[PDB]
UniProtKB/Swiss-Prot annotation, chain A:
Stomach. It comes from Sus scrofa. This is Potassium-transporting ATPase subunit beta. The ATPase pump is composed of two subunits: alpha (catalytic) and beta (regulatory). Interacts with alpha subunit ATP12A; this interaction is required for the formation of a functionally active pump and targeting at the plasma membrane. Interacts (via N-terminus) with alpha subunit ATP4A (via the P-domain). GO terms for molecular function: ATPase activator activity. The keyword Transmembrane helix applies. PANTHER family: POTASSIUM-TRANSPORTING ATPASE SUBUNIT BETA, SODIUM/POTASSIUM-DEPENDENT ATPASE BETA SUBUNIT. The lineage of its organism: Eukaryota, Metazoa, Chordata, Craniata, Vertebrata. Disulfide bonds join 64-85.
From Swiss-Prot, chain B:
Residues 174-196 are annotated as: Disordered. The keyword Translocase applies. The gene is ATP4A. One of its GO terms (molecular function) is potassium ion binding. SUPFAM superfamilies: Calcium ATPase, transduction domain A, Calcium ATPase, transmembrane domain M, HAD-like, Metal cation-transporting ATPase, ATP-binding domain N. Its EC number is 7.2.2.19. This is Potassium-transporting ATPase alpha chain 1. GO terms for biological process: intracellular potassium ion homeostasis; intracellular sodium ion homeostasis; potassium ion import across plasma membrane; potassium ion transmembrane transport; proton transmembrane transport; sodium ion export across plasma membrane. Down-regulated by K(+)-competitive acid blockers (P-CABs) such as vonoprazan. It comes from Sus scrofa (Pig).
Length: 175, 986
């Protein structure tokens, strides 16, 4: 608490916090420079793709068929946007979490993907890219269902991410 | 002060007491009175603090801060009970942590104080004792407690005075009022009334005072608590401690912290409401922000810091009854010291000798640190043998190893001083007194008190008998004729005779007691070798003797005292001598110790030199003054304040204990911190009232020791100096420590702030913050306590409680505003590097948290278009917390280094010399590295291994911190009155 000196405080921080924000941003901008615009430096975190579903818990493009992987080339800009292939008793849809340059490998409880889509090239490379029923007899009861995917590339973490390559939902159609 | 009935005719006295002077009282009455009031004994210490006292340690002022903090956290937790909350690991944990700290710190501090008390208990050795009473004409020894009021009592040599008595009759009785009154030498007691003040009068004996010699009868005036010492003892328990200066400083500190806490809590509460968060959320944010501002670890770091210093003091044999009592000394402006027992040794000894019409000062010091006179002269030899030979003084069996001065001796006061002196200078008196066999001696007579003794000759030259005698200078002057010089005799001439007289008056005026020593050879022809002379007739010519010389004596200050006082004065501390002794001696000792510098004249000195009435001289011209207690009784508050203000060097002489209290209080009236050092009971009221009392371990009495806040077991006065020094360095280091810890709050709090504002995934977690505040920073924070003096602290003046503050605006201005900010940015930079690298560019991170935090959304698009499940991205968030943690550590490295010095550059002091700080950063980095790399960490603490590159991102920021504060440390040194020092320099 002073007087006729606050100007020495205000002006100080104005050109101090300024120098700091200027340095902070200075470091973020250099960091940003050393990263690809098409691919992350680390894919490890997403190593094993997880499986997610719909149920809240095409002009141009190319026609394709169930077949092997299709390489659009390298992940570069020299070529324009890489073309993408076309595509009671509730219905749930499942999809595989998109992961750049990842090729999936493939080449009784209670009563109740095509390789031609991979590898995914990423949003920047492929903007409008498109990634690829429980008529059960029982009703009025909670049924635990686990839909999972198999492959050498796919791994599950039962103790952790129950989503990693698998599902776990309890449908109940009370009628 | 007290009053009494001491001046009364015995007839009047007994008339009032209804007692017989010779017969005493009748058993019936004695028993009746004893049963009426209460036995002769002081009511045991009205303080029996139960173990419940432990609770005391728990409250205090600081522990209260943590208490309220813990309560706040608990309430916050109670509030979050409104919904399903993560707090199970957050708030409840913190609240409990806070309570854990207060209780643990309390237990530690309590144990310390307890250990000291136990040690104290070991010293208590009690003996009931007994008193000799005379009832119905018969003398009977009964338990002292049985003594009643108004009954004749008999005191002998060595017996303690059972209760306050009014001496009716006495025979060469000399009581020792050393501890109660403060009177150094044994005061004789007689039936006649000598002085108005009952304390100085001879007609009264006091409780707890031992009678050195003689015998006396007396009527018991006071019994039990009503006695004088009892009155003093009672008063020495009704005084208040007052808040310690360090305690108030911390109070101000909490005010600042809480102030910032409330401001941000409130401001953000309003801000939150403006955005959209429900009131519930707004409240949880309020509680969150406030609680976050409370440094949990700082309570432990402060307690330990004080403990460490206290431990050092303990090593010096300087014990602190209270933990806070460590810092105080660095705040003392005035020291009221006692004379005898404190400043002095309280032991009498030979002062000056008179040979060849010259005065030669002897070595008065206990340690014999003084200078020895010239022993060569023969006159000295002769006087020595006369002093050595004529005495009843002899060392007791057992005093061989012990130093000749401290060793005990059985004999009179003067004879003891003389014996010790002989034994020291001339050699052993044993063989010497044995040399000359004493045939017949005349002990001091009731009148003229001359003491003579005649021995045979040891020398082979002349076979004449040797006669020796000592006595009062005037009486001996009457009996002496011849005078000896350089080994040759001469008759007495008025010139030299007067020289002797003047010398006598000079030494006598010096305050010392002088004794005339003379000897005479006998005409062997008249007195044959076989002749056996008795005491009956005058066998030796009492007159015509050869007067050798005089021997005086006094008691000196301890060896360490003089230098200690000089240091206290150089420190800027005003030294005031408050003694109940006589002014003549008081002033002399004052000048000796340095309380009264040489060249400084009192009002009397000026009046004396000018030969003008003392009243004429203007007090202003006198810098020093010796104020008699007689005037002190009349003086008013304005009088005392004037005296204290107008005179730099002051000495209060002949001052009663109550008066010592008023003097201390008068010094407090000035608003200055007073420190009192004493020895006896007279200092009990003073030592307790002072901001800090100082007793003497051995030389001090029990009452005063109980009243003292600090005790000196070694009885070294120099310790006081060390004490005052020991109090000021710790203050600066505390600033260092506090500043450091306070700097961490910015990079810790900010992450949660921005989280709420920008809506970005939480950068730093709760567990992480705890590892910084409690895990890593702990060692470095304590290491700073080891910082040494930046400059000569003793040179600088004592800090001002008002102006100077431990934690002031400037400190906050830099821990929170400057350095703290730099760290925060360092942390976030690390955050962005990890995120951007993982696939989440900074720009996209905004407003991502709502989706991010949601456990249900498995498909979360990053910058690349990838889809992240919950655990995946959360893993990134956790691997993002660790790096932020590590980043804090790296920034703390620079902060610790700069925190090391307040003014000086790292160059000068070299923060590296401090080994503990060094091990602090090595252990800190090691631990941080461990938490990140240890195998089970991500499971338990949710801390994941950090990619090596990550470690580097916070590096440049740390360098900025160091380089920045260093230049600041340079600019400050260059421009003392610079604008940086005013703002920065805390």
């Amino acid at each position: 608490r002073t007087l006729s000196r606050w100007v020495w405080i205000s002006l100080y921080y104005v050109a101090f916090y300024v120098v700091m924000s200027g340095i902070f941003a200075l470091c973020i901008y250099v960091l940003m420079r050393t990263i690809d615009p098409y691919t992350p430096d680390y894919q490890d975190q997403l190593k094993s793709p997880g499986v997610t579903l719909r149920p809240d818990v095409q002009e141009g493009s190319i026609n394709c068929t169930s077949e092997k992987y299709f390489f659009q080339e390298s992940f570069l800009a020299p070529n324009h946007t890489k073309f993408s292939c076309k595509f009671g008793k509730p219905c749930f849809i499942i999809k595989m979490n998109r992961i750049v340059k990842f090729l999936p490998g493939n080449s009784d409880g209670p009563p109740l993907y095509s390789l031609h889509y991979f590898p995914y090239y990423g949003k920047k490379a492929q903007p409008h890219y498109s990634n690829p029923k429980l008529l059960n007899v029982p009703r009025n009861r909670d049924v635990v269902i686990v839909c999972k995917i198999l492959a050498e590339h796919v791994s599950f973490d039962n103790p952790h991410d129950p989503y990693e390559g698998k599902v776990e939902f309890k449908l109940k159609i009370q009628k | 002060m007290e009053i009494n009935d001491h001046q009364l005719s015995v007839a009047e006295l007994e008339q009032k007491y209804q007692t017989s002077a010779t017969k005493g009282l009748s058993a019936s009455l004695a028993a009746e009175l004893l049963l009426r009031d209460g036995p002769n004994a002081l009511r045991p210490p009205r303080g029996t603090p139960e173990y419940v006292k432990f609770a005391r340690q728990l409250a205090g002022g600081l522990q209260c801060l943590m208490w309220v903090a813990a309560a706040i956290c608990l309430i916050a937790f109670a509030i979050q009970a409104s919904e399903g909350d993560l707090t199970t690991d957050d708030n409840l944990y913190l609240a409990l942590a806070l309570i854990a700290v207060v209780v643990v710190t309390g237990c530690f501090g309590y144990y310390q104080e307890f250990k000291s008390t136990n040690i104290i208990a070991s010293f208590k050795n009690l003996v009931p004792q007994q008193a000799t009473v005379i009832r119905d004409g018969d003398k009977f020894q009964i338990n002292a407690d049985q003594l009643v009021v108004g009954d004749l009592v008999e005191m002998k040599g060595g017996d303690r005075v059972p209760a306050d008595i009014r001496i009716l009759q006495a025979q060469g009785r000399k009581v020792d009022n050393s501890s109660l009154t403060g009177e150094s030498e044994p005061q004789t007691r007689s039936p006649e009334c000598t002085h108005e003040s009952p304390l100085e009068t001879r007609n009264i004996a006091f409780f707890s005072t031992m009678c050195l010699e003689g015998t006396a009868q007396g009527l018991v005036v006071n019994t039990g608590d009503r006695t004088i010492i009892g009155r003093i003892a009672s008063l020495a328990s009704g005084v208040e401690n007052e808040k310690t200066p360090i305690a108030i400083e911390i109070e101000h500190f909490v005010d600042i912290i809480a102030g910032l806490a409330i401001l941000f809590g409130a401001t953000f509460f309003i801000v939150a409401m403006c955005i959209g968060y429900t009131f519930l959320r707004a409240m949880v944010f309020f509680m969150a922000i406030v609680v976050a501002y409370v440094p949990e670890g700082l309570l432990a770091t402060v307690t330990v810091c004080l403990s460490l210093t206290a431990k050092r003091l303990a090593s010096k044999n300087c014990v602190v009854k209270n933990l806070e009592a460590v810092e105080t000394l660095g705040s003392t402006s005035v020291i009221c010291s006692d004379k005898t027992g404190t400043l002095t040794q309280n032991r009498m000894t030979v002062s000056h000798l008179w040979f060849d019409n010259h005065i030669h000062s002897a070595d008065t010091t206990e340690d014999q640190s003084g200078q020895t006179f010239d022993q060569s002269s023969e006159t000295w030899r002769a006087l020595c043998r006369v002093l050595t030979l004529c005495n009843r003084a002899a060392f007791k069996s057992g005093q061989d190893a012990v130093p000749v001065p401290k060793r005990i001796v059985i004999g009179d006061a003067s004879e003891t001083a003389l014996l010790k002196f002989s034994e020291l200078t001339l050699g052993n008196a044993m063989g010497y007194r044995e040399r000359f066999p004493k045939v017949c001696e005349i002990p001091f007579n009731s009148t003229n008190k001359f003491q003579l003794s005649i021995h045979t000759l040891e020398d082979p030259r002349d076979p004449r008998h040797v006669l020796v005698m000592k006595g009062a200078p005037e009486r001996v002057l009457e009996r002496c004729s011849s005078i000896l010089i350089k080994g040759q005799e001469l008759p007495l001439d008025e010139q030299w005779r007067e020289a002797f007289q003047t010398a006598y008056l000079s030494l006598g005026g010096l305050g010392e007691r002088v004794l005339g020593f003379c000897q005479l050879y006998l005409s062997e022809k008249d007195y044959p070798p076989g002749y056996a002379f008795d005491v009956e007739a005058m066998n030796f010519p009492t007159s015509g003797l050869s007067f050798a010389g005089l021997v005086s004596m006094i008691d000196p200050p301890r060896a360490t005292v003089p230098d200690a006082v000089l240091k206290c004065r150089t420190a800027g501390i005003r030294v005031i001598m408050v003694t109940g002794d006589h002014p003549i001696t008081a002033k002399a000792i004052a000048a000796s110790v340095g309380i009264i510098s040489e060249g400084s004249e009192t009002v009397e000195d000026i009046a004396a030199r000018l030969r003008v009435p003392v009243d004429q001289v203007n007090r202003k011209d006198a810098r020093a003054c010796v104020i008699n207690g007689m005037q002190l009784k009349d003086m008013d508050p304005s009088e005392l304040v004037e005296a204290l203000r107008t005179h730099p060097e002051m000495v209060f002489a002949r001052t009663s204990p109550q008066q010592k209290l008023v003097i201390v209080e008068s010094c407090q009236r000035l608003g200055a911190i007073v420190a009192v050092t004493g020895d006896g009971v007279n200092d009990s009221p003073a030592l307790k009232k002072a901001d800090i009392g100082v007793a003497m371990g051995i030389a001090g009495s029990d009452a005063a020791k109980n009243a003292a806040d600090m005790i000196l077991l070694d009885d070294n006065f120099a310790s006081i100096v060390t004490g005052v020094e020991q109090g000021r360095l710790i203050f600066d280091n505390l600033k260092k420590s506090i500043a450091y810890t306070l700097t961490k709050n910015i990079p810790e709090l900010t992450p949660y702030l921005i989280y709420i504002t920008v809506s970005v995934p939480l950068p730093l977690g709760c567990i992480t913050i705890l590892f910084i505040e409690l895990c890593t920073d702990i060692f470095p924070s304590v290491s700073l306590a080891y910082e040494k003096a930046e400059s000569d602290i003793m040179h600088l003046r004592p800090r001002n409680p008002k102006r100077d503050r431990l934690v002031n605006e400037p400190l906050a201005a830099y821990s929170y505003f400057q350095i703290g900010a730099i760290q925060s940015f360092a942390g976030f930079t690390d955050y962005f590097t990890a995120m951007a690298q993982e696939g989440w560019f900074p720009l996209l991170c905004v407003g991502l948290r709502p989706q991010w935090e949601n456990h249900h959304l498995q498909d979360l698009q990053d910058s690349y278009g990838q889809e992240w499940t919950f655990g995946q991205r959360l893993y990134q968030q956790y691997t993002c917390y660790t790096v932020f943690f590590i980043s804090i550590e790296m920034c703390q490295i620079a902060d610790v280094l700069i925190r090391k010095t307040r003014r000086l550059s790292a160059f000068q002091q070299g923060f590296f010399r401090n080994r503990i700080l060094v091990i602090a950063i090595v252990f800190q980095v090691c631990i941080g590295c461990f938490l990140c790399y240890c195998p089970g960490m991500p499971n338990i603490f949710n801390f994941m291994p950090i990619r090596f590159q990550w470690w580097l991102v916070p590096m440049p920021f740390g360098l900025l911190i160091f380089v920045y504060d260093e230049i600041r440390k340079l600019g400050v040194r260059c421009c003392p009155g610079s604008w940086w020092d005013q703002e920065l320099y805390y």
